[PDB]
A paper describes a structure:
The 9-1-1 DNA checkpoint clamp is loaded onto 5′-recessed DNA to activate the DNA damage checkpoint that arrests the cell cycle.
In one conformation the 9-1-1 ring is closed, but in the other the ring is wide open with a 27-Å gap. The most striking feature is that the DNA is bound only by the [name] subunit in an extended groove on its AAA+ module and extending to the collar domain. The third loop is hook-like, projecting from the [name] AAA+ domain, and interacts with Ddc1 of the 9-1-1 clamp in the closed state. The interface between [name] and Ddc1 is 400 Å2 in the closed state and is reduced slightly to 350 Å2 in the open state. In both closed and open 9-1-1 clamp states, the first four interfaces ([name]:[name], [name]:[name], [name]:[name] and [name]:[name]) are occupied by ATPγS and Mg2+, and an adenosine diphosphate (ADP) occupies the last interface between [name] and the A′ subdomain of [name]. The [name]-[name] complex conformation is essentially unchanged in the 9-1-1–DNA open and closed states.
Residue numbers in the entry:
A (entry chain B): 7 to 323
B (entry chain C): 9 to 333
C (entry chain G): 135 to 268
D (entry chain D): 24 to 353
E (entry chain A): 63 to 130, 146 to 495
F (entry chain E): 1 to 120, 134 to 354
Write the structure that this text describes.
DNA sequence: GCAGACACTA
DNA sequence: TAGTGTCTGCTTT
């Protein structure tokens, strides 16, 4: 029964959590003071939001959090009536809490919860904010309605830098006592793209499939991310080079055409070097190829035509 | 159980060693199960690679007699809504062992069709109940999957089947049923496979019925090309040569004669021409742009329907005009 | 429907490692299950404990939005025929030991009507955690 | 009695005339029980429905039509839930029990066949749901997909189902069949009427059969006892006369917009279908050897564009006027 | 401890964050409602969150009820034992109806019942309509506060009709209650920069001992003015100020980043954003901000109708033709996110190219498609009546196309002479 | 009664004043009704294809074809949305009303064709304007006429049959109904004015009506009706040929586009287009009429006309797939202004 | 975002 | 007194 590294090596205190020094320091300060108001935590997945909330609740309450709170996550019936009733009962049932401590309502993955439940939560806060406090763990703050965010201090988690992920990887390697190579670690960081959970999964797979962590083994088990390949494809000068890159990196690797079109659209949205006219022309061509793919024609000829038209509009004769 | 099923579901692998092509994935999964750790395997690739066959063989090898009870199979055939993932998956991935302390495997085949709320509930399930139950996700389109799910699942890429895997499977099929196949037909099947085992098995099943005598004879290029209907490479080369040197009259006559001699399709001719023209050296890139754009437009029009003669003359005119640069 | 009948199956158990056994009347258990359903109690607990003074303890307690519910089944021999707790060998009876079972409410709701018309109900579970109800 | 399309519909596998490969594969399957999932595709009116009906008749028989055959079409609701539940219910039924007469007479396979016509117009979600039902339940059931649009069927379905292309029914592919029909129905042709009918027809035999029936009815009504000529089938087929096409070409040759527009209006007020006019103009322009390569390529591209526009459900008058104006200005 | 916005609640009418005109025209509105005969039976308040839409009425009831603090605020989280939520609001209205004398308790429905199911949404309209035309002596005041916030996009919404797109008074309320004679709609605006700055001054000087403990007394002015200018919500401003004051330092504070409006987005696409000079980042941020509005019909029509107001229709005709052609080409992509991006990008690029001749602009108009549909329905029912009356004495089959094209003018002309 | 469209309608098959080739062809078809296959009619609007269908039904069935039999049927789509259709009934045949929306068109066709079929002579179904279907109803008709081709006959009349899918065109016999020449329309009008003995000094007005309606029987008859009732049943050679508000509005819009080419002119064109489109009309015929009126301007040269017709074809293609119509209409108008300026 | 009209002291 | 700050629009079966 070997527990996976994502769950076995998850942090239990806020000290082990790295990536945003200011936010962790703020969480430690607000736990030491104990005056924790409502907050919303948002960011790209795999950065350490829900584990940070759990660790904060742990080292803020202890036995009280362990025994006498009601934590709800996405794996429950999040209907309006049942959630209303559950949070209404949880707002009651006060204990001999310390004067600087309050109940915490952990809300994990609240982006998919219905608007009526948000209104019921609004009423619950406006009626019993004195006894309990709410904590929100989500990906983006747009899915939360406007009135909820006015009663809370929104905290944003930035993407983890390479230094913090590398430090965590070295700590986990020292804990596991496994050989490593600097090239392999650099490849792991490059493949992760700031995703801590993906980096942990890749390192665990490398360790359990090849032993020593090396760049060659990592590249063998997992290839380069497709956004980088598509970005290099769109920035290619010659059409033949772009066609060869497309074929040898997506057609021979087993990549669906619709996924390639979606990645091209995402890259073109976030591209910055191209001009506005070139960007909109590329977006139009990507959309035309996407509707052609959706209507049924899912062959490589459509991708080749998209690349040819993109090169033609880039060169402009 | 055998000799009563289609060839696709007749040579389905039952063990891990019977899966060919993705040797690295098989070795990595074997190391994972030898160490005793399943890191929420996620399989991605084109259809026909063998993701579900591999995962079913792996589950059989791990479990044995516990496949009936502890292994759960999920698909798009049954209802997969918010209530289904909320109740059935939660109830199944909450139980203890019965005879062996092995992990719990849940097969999410073609899981790309699930709703966003269902995907979010599923990923909150995988995060919470990971200490005893490990899920497996199978999909062909990664754009339909929530990016949070990909972070929590170890992604494994299923490459198209290489030439050696197709040749080994062809040899295994031939030995089992005592069938002889010519090396030219083998090369034709390698070219036509395009990294698909199901297509190879389907065309091999039909070529057996094409021959009047199942035994005491071989399968040549003519039988393979007549069975599926793919154009011969010689026919494609002759059509391209006629287009290149003859402008419209004898070129159109040759194209019509080739198409009417056997019943060739415009589409298959289009992939034949693009395949034999991809290796051409054209240092202007305007010919390449024009050829790609016009051929894609013609293929789209054929997919939408139209006149066969009109589309064939359109192909001829596009090829002639593009090469004029 | 006999196409993909996987056969075998069976949530059976071995009698060599039975944690404890209990025999109770159907009427006594039906009242407990009926009260357990309408109140809610999405998570339920099974407690088994023997006493040297023959004061055996067995109850179906649960937690819900109401709080803590303690449906204490009777301990006398009038409607509780037999109750002993084993040490994982099904032959070595031990007194003072407690067996705690964490069961879902959905499983309990299925046997509520089964015990509505019954004479004797037999409870048996092992160390593996599976429960057999006769 | 019955129209010749349905009266002369094939009932046996050997009654076909052009699709040799699929029919002989099914015939060699008749002595076995390893029939795979089939994907029938090709031009309209090539007999895919006739082929599957004949195969079913050879396999099961009229007694087993009502017990081992399920057909789902566009005539009823084809939603995701209804199709899902119906396919799951029928693809789970046990093997039927044939009588001793059925086993003695016909070779009864141990499986059942599910036929899904016009599968092109089926949503992708339904096909995704049906993928696993086709795959893991295929022990004693099979699925047949018939559709004239290959691209409308997604990639996973094209892999599980064996691809059986149906050849376009050209002239020599159906000359014998039309000759047999003419002898059976007592239809007289002088030199090349049947060949002309297949030339007019777009690679199908049903339209040709309907045209032959109309010509025979007209000849019977006329009652003079003469044979059908090519002019009669050309007139009843909507074929533009050669003189009018020559006039169209001559007016296009002259570089005047007003006369061209007036003649286009006069041609369109006759209500003639623009597709036939486009095809006749295209074949005349390619057949003519008085034009160079660049003009031929340009006019072929414009004709292809106009054909796509017309097939996309646009106005015939505007499209034909634009095509003739573009041709005149080359 | 205690929230700053809760411990610093206003106690008089001079501490609430509201404009003088808004205070005046809610005071005159509420004063006339307390009379036995009132022109407006109920009061409707619509505006953004945190705009003093409820506290102002709270002290207003505090200083008007004792003339003849009695507030009957509806609690939607009540269940009421074995009572459906649909009938709960019906019982609340009749329970608070019997307060016309002696008690005189004002009704403040801040938390309206959730209206998302078909049955419960339709019930909400006639429940207040039955209370309007009821011929009963006297009248207790009733104030309904509705927050204007758009509901975020969800999955598998099927037809994707109204209400669920944006939770606003116009979407849920029907036409009968919107322009009812016995109803006043007093809109609300976000808190001004001056009022927010004054309130933050008051909070800072009230918390002088806490702020002077750390190194925040010198830095407070920049933080508070940035907070006041960044958002118009007083509650969010107080929350951010409390978080910053509790914070030791070196922490970048965050704000809700409230979504922009429909006409605001239209102006952003046509004119441009001064905050973001770069064109690429403006559209990309707007997409992730409100995709729920861009991936919706009538927005492209709004761009089509308001693009001639850039220079009062005095710009390049070729540029206008290119813009309209690009929108028409976008319309063929079956309403995809890629389709919306290309057309808006082209419009913004063109208007940036011709931005030099943009000194004077015009007003934008939301497209009149509802009127076109209404006249279409009227013509449809008129044609149905014409076919019904013309088929009872003879036979006439010409399909619907010939009636609209040929018989739409010839047929009335012939009957005019006869 | 009210109009010449329905009053002096040709009852018998032998009372047709148009060309006799089509009449002889349909008489040959109607000689053996048992062997008659599914039929499809294509031609210009107003030619009278429904008259040929009624004459064929008279030849096959006999007297009693024209029966009112107004019936109302209720149909239920997915979820919950009641639909109403005032379908017309008749003994031995039934006519389909295509007035329902294209999206929810499968339910009505499927239910009513199953109701006419049942299991059981045959009952014929007439389906006018079959081009409005979104190919789903077309597939439904295809399957219905394939599977149940023992007791059902489909006779569909339509104009510009290009949107009709290829499989349907293969399974149905093609009937061509060309519009009559000016001589036949003049003869019909002369027969009408002789029947009612109205005043007529010069026959040039009859030729003017015949040539001004573009070979349309209904349009010519209604134009004759409008001027006859407005002139006390006394036609005059000096009486101008009047046109509906449709043609006047189209010509005024064309003149405004040709004269004024500006963004203000564009928004007034938008207002005119919205006022036109507020009457439940398809935009394809509006685009065709605008293109034909633009090509009739004498001041334009061949290059402007070629550009106008090319962009008209392009925007008609765009309108073919587009959900809206105002976008493509304004695009075509703006392109025309750009070319003219 | 922008046009039209008002509050308020610099 | 001319600038700077800010309310109303600009919206439906
Ligand atoms: N700063 C960190 N230091 C160490 N491990 C981390 C850190 N951030 C994330 N992890 C690891 O990430 C895994 C799960 O993190 P999560 O908090 O669940 O991801 P997330 O950022 O919350 O994204 P979502 O929305 O939950 S999918 C665990 O294995 C953690 O150990
Ligand atoms: N590597 C392989 N070696 C041998 N046979 C294979 C291999 N991959 C696929 N096959 C055969 O292909 C058949 C169909 O492939 P499956 O594994 O069932 O489906 P899949 O390849 O995973 O594609 P999807 O995603 O399910 S559509 C199997 O039953 C095998 O007979
Ligand atoms: N090989 C053939 N020999 C003789 N008649 C044939 C043959 N193929 C087709 N037919 C004729 O074609 C008609 C049957 O064709 P269908 O099967 O209905 O058309 P289809 O194949 O279904 O085309 P679809 O479904 O519209 S794509 C009958 O009139 C047959 O006589
Ligand atoms: N000077 C002030 N003026 C107004 N509100 C203040 C002030 N000082 C503190 N507050 C608080 O700010 C909040 C504003 O409340 P309101 O905006 O009236 O409520 P609301 O408008 O109903 O909010 P929603 O949209 O319903 S969640 C209350 O919690 C007040 O106690
Ligand atoms: N052979 C004919 N002789 C005289 N009038 C005819 C003839 N055929 C049709 N019509 C006229 O056509 C009118 C009906 O046209 P209609 O069937 O509505 O055209 P469409 O079928 O194109 O809609 C009738 O009023 C009738 O007077
Ligand atoms: Mg989380
Ligand atoms: Mg699979
Ligand atoms: Mg068919
Ligand atoms: Mg409030």
């Amino acid at each position: 029964l070997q527990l996976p590294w994502v769950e076995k090596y998850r942090p239990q205190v806020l000290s082990d959590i790295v990536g945003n020094k200011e936010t962790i320091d703020r969480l430690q300060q607000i736990a030491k003071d104990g005056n924790m108001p409502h907050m919303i935590i948002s960011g790209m997945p795999g950065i350490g939001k829900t584990t940070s909330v759990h660790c904060l609740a742990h080292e803020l309450l202890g036995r009280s959090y362990a025994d006498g709170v009601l934590e709800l996550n996405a794996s429950d019936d999040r209907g309006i009536d049942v959630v209303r009733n559950q949070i209404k009962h949880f707002a009651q049932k006060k204990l001999h809490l310390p004067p600087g401590k309050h109940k915490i309502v952990i809300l994990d993955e609240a982006d998919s919860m219905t608007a009526g439940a948000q209104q019921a939560l609004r009423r619950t806060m406006e009626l019993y904010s004195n006894s309990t406090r709410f904590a929100f763990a989500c990906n983006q703050s747009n899915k939360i309605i406007e009135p909820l965010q006015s009663r809370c201090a929104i905290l944003r988690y930035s993407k983890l830098s390479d230094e913090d992920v590398l430090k965590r990887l070295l700590q986990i390697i020292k804990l596991e006592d496994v050989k490593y190579t600097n090239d392999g670690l650099e490849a792991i960081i490059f493949t992760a793209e700031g995703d801590m959970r993906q980096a942990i999964n890749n390192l665990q797979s490398t360790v359990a499939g090849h032993g020593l962590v090396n760049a060659d083994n990592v590249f063998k088990i997992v290839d380069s991310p497709h956004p980088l390949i598509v970005k290099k494809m769109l920035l290619a000068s010659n059409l033949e080079d772009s066609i060869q890159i497309l074929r040898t990196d997506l057609w021979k690797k087993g990549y669906s055409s619709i996924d390639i079109v979606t990645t091209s659209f995402r890259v073109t949205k976030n591209l910055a070097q191209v001009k506005e006219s070139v960007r909109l022309e590329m977006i139009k061509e990507i959309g035309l190829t996407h509707m052609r793919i959706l209507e049924g024609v899912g062959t490589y000829l459509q991708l080749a035509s998209m690349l040819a038209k993109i090169h033609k509009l880039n060169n402009k004769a | 159980s055998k000799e009563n099923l289609p060839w696709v579901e007749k040579y389905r692998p039952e063990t891990l060693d019977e899966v060919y092509g993705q040797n690295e994935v098989i070795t990595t999964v074997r190391k994972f199960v030898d160490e005793g750790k399943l890191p929420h395997l996620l399989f991605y690739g084109p259809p026909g690679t063998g993701k579900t066959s591999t995962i079913v063989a792996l589950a059989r090898e791990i479990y044995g007699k516990n496949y009936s009870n502890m292994v759960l199979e999920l698909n798009a055939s049954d209802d997969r809504g918010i209530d289904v993932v909320r109740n059935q998956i939660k109830d199944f991935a909450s139980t203890r062992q019965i005879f062996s302390k092995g992990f719990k495997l849940i097969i999410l085949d073609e899981a790309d069709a699930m709703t966003n709320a269902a995907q979010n509930a599923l990923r909150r399930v995988i995060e919470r109940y990971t200490k005893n139950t490990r899920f497996c996700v199978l999909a062909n389109y990664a754009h339909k999957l929530t990016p949070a799910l990909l972070s929590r699942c170890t992604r494994f890429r299923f490459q198209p089947l290489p030439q050696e895997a197709i040749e080994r499977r062809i040899a295994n099929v031939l030995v089992h049923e005592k069938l002889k196949l010519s090396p030219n037909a083998e090369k034709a099947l390698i070219e036509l496979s395009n990294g698909d085992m199901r297509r190879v098995l389907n065309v091999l099943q039909s070529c057996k019925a094409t021959l009047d005598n199942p035994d005491e004879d071989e399968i040549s290029d003519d039988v393979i090309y007549e069975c599926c209907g793919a154009p011969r490479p010689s026919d494609l080369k002759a059509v391209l040569k006629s287009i290149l040197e003859d402008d419209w009259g004898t070129a159109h006559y040759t194209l019509n004669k080739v198409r009417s001699a056997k019943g060739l399709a415009l589409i298959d001719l289009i992939e034949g021409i693009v395949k034999i023209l991809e290796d051409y050296e054209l240092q202007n890139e305007e010919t390449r742009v024009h050829l790609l754009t016009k051929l894609a437009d013609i293929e789209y029009s054929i997919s939408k329907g139209g006149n066969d003669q009109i589309q064939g003359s359109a192909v001829i005119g596009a090829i002639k005009a593009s090469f004029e640069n | 429907y006999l196409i993909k009948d996987f056969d075998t199956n069976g949530l059976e158990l071995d009698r060599e490692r039975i944690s404890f056994e209990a025999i109770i009347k159907g009427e006594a258990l039906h009242s407990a299950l009926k009260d357990l359903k309408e109140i809610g109690c999405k998570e339920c607990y099974v407690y088994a404990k023997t006493e040297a003074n023959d004061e055996n303890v067995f109850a179906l307690i649960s937690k819900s939005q109401l709080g803590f519910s303690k449906i204490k089944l009777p301990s006398n021999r009038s409607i509780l025929e037999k109750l002993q707790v084993f040490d994982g060998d099904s032959t070595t009876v031990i007194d003072g030991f407690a067996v705690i079972g964490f069961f879902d409410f959905t499983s309990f709701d299925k046997i509520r009507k089964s015990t509505k018309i019954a004479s004797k109900v037999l409870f048996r579970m092992d160390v593996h955690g599976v429960l057999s109800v006769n | 009695q019955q129209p010749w399309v349905e009266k002369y519909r094939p009932k046996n596998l050997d009654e076909v005339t052009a699709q040799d490969h699929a029919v002989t594969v099914l015939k060699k399957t008749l002595k076995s029980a390893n029939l795979p999932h089939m994907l029938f595709y090709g031009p309209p009116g090539t007999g895919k429905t006739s082929t599957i009906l004949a195969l079913t008749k050879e396999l099961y028989g009229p007694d087993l039509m009502k017990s081992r055959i399920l057909e789902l079409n566009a005539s009823d609701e084809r939603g995701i839930s209804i199709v899902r539940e119906k396919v799951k219910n029928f693809a789970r039924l046990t093997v039927s029990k044939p009588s001793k007469h059925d086993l003695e007479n016909y070779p009864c396979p141990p499986y059942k066949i599910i036929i899904l016509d016009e599968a092109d117009s089926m949503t992708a979600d339904a096909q995704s749901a049906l993928r696993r039902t086709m795959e893991t339940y295929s022990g004693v059931t099979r699925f047949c997909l018939i559709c004239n649009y290959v691209t409308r069927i997604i990639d996973p379905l094209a892999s599980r189902c064996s691809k059986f292309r149906f050849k376009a029914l050209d002239a020599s592919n159906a000359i014998d069949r039309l000759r047999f029909i003419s002898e059976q129905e007592n239809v007289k042709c002088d030199d090349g009427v049947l060949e002309r009918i297949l030339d007019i027809s777009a690679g199908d035999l049903r339209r040709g059969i309907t045209l032959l029936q109309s010509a025979s009815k007209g000849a019977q009504y006329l009652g003079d006892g003469k044979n059908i000529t090519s002019t009669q089938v050309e007139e009843l087929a909507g074929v533009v006369p050669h003189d009018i096409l020559i006039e169209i070409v001559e007016k296009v040759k002259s570089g005047d917009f007003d006369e061209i527009k007036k003649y286009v209006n006069t041609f369109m007020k006759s209500g003639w279908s623009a597709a036939s006019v486009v095809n006749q103009l295209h074949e005349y322009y390619i057949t003519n050897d008085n034009f160079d390569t660049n003009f031929k390529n340009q006019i072929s591209w414009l004709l292809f564009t106009t054909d796509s526009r017309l097939n996309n459900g646009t106005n015939e008058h505007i499209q034909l006027l634009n095509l003739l104006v573009k041709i005149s200005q080359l | 401890g205690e929230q700053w916005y809760e411990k610093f609640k206003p106690n008089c009418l001079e501490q609430v964050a509201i404009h003088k005109r808004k205070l005046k025209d809610v005071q005159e509105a509420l004063d006339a409602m307390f009379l036995p005969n009132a022109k407006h039976r109920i009061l409707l308040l619509s505006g953004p969150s945190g705009c003093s839409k409820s506290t102002v009425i709270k002290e207003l009831s505090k200083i008007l009820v004792p003339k003849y603090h009695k507030v009957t605020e509806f609690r939607g989280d009540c269940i009421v034992n074995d009572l459906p939520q649909m009938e709960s609001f019906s019982e609340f209205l009749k329970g608070a109806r019997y307060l016309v004398m002696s008690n005189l308790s004002l009704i403040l429905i801040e938390d309206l019942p959730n209206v998302f199911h078909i049955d419960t949404r339709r019930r909400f309209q006639q429940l207040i309509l039955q209370w309007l035309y009821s011929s009963e002596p006297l009248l207790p005041p009733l104030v309904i506060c509705i927050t204007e916030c758009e509901i975020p996009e969800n999955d598998n919404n099927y037809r994707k009709f109204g209400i669920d797109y944006t939770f606003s008074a116009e979407t849920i309320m029907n036409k009968e209650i919107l322009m009812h004679p016995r109803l006043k709609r007093i809109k609300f605006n976000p808190i001004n920069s001056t009022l927010l700055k004054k309130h933050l001054k008051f909070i800072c000087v009230q918390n002088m001992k806490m702020l002077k403990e750390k190194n925040k007394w010198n830095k407070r002015q920049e933080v508070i003015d940035y907070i006041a200018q960044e958002t118009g919500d007083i509650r969010s401003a107080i929350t951010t100020l409390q978080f910053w004051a509790t914070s030791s330092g070196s922490l970048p504070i965050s704000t809700r980043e409230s979504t922009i409006s429909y006409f605001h987005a239209i102006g952003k696409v046509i004119h441009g954003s001064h905050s973001t000079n770069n064109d690429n980042e403006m559209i990309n941020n707007l997409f992730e901000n409100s995709n729920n509005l861009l991936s919706k019909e009538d927005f492209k029509l709004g761009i089509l109708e308001n693009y001639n107001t850039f220079n009062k229709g005095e710009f390049s005709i070729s540029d206008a033709s290119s813009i309209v052609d690009c929108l028409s080409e976008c319309d063929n992509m079956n309403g995809l996110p890629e389709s919306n991006e290309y057309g808006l990008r082209e419009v913004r690029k063109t208007f940036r190219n011709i931005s030099k001749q943009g000194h004077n602009h015009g007003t934008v108009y939301f497209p009149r498609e509802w009127k076109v549909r209404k006249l279409q329905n009227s013509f449809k029912v008129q044609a149905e009546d014409w076919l019904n009356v013309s088929l009872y004495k003879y036979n006439a089959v010409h399909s619907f196309r010939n009636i609209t094209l040929e018989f739409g003018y010839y047929a009335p002309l012939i009957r005019k002479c006869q | 009664m009210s109009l010449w469209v329905d009053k002096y309608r040709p009852k018998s098959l032998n009372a047709l004043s148009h060309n006799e080739e089509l009449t002889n062809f349909l008489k040959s078809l109607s000689d053996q009704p048992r062997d008659l296959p599914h039929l499809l009619l294509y031609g210009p609007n107003g030619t009278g294809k429904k008259t040929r269908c009624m004459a064929l039904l008279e030849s096959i069935f006999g007297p009693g074809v024209y029966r009112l039999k107004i019936d109302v049927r209720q149909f239920v789509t997915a979820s919950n949305r009641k639909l109403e259709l005032n379908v017309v009934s008749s003994p031995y045949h039934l006519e389909i009303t295509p007035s329902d929306m294209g999206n929810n068109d499968r339910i009505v066709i499927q239910e009513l064709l199953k109701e006419v079929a049942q299991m059981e002579r045959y009952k014929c179904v007439i389906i006018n304007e079959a081009n409005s279907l979104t190919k789903d109803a077309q597939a439904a008709l295809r399957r219905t006429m394939e599977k149940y081709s023992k007791n059902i006959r489909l006779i569909m009349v339509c104009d510009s049959m290009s949107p009709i899918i290829a499989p349907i065109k293969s399974r149905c016999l093609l009937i061509r109904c060309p519009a009559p020449s000016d001589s036949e329309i003049s003869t019909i009008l002369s027969d009408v004015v002789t029947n009612e003995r109205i005043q007529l000094e010069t026959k040039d007005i009859l030729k003017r009506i015949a040539q001004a309606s573009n070979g349309n029987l209904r349009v010519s008859l209604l134009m004759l009706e409008s001027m006859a009732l407005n002139n006390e049943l006394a036609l005059k050679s000096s009486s101008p040929i009047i046109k509906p508000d449709w043609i006047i509005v189209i010509h005024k819009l064309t003149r405004k586009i040709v004269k004024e080419r500006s963004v203000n002119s564009l928004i007034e064109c938008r207002a005119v287009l919205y006022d036109l489109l507020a009457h439940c009309i398809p935009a394809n015929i509006i685009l065709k009429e605008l293109t034909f009126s633009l090509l009739d301007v004498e001041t334009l040269n061949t290059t402007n006309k070629s550009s106008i017709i090319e962009y008209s074809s392009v925007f008609d293609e765009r309108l073919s797939l587009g959900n809206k119509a105002i976008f493509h209409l304004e695009g075509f108008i703006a392109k025309v202004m750009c070319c003219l300026d």
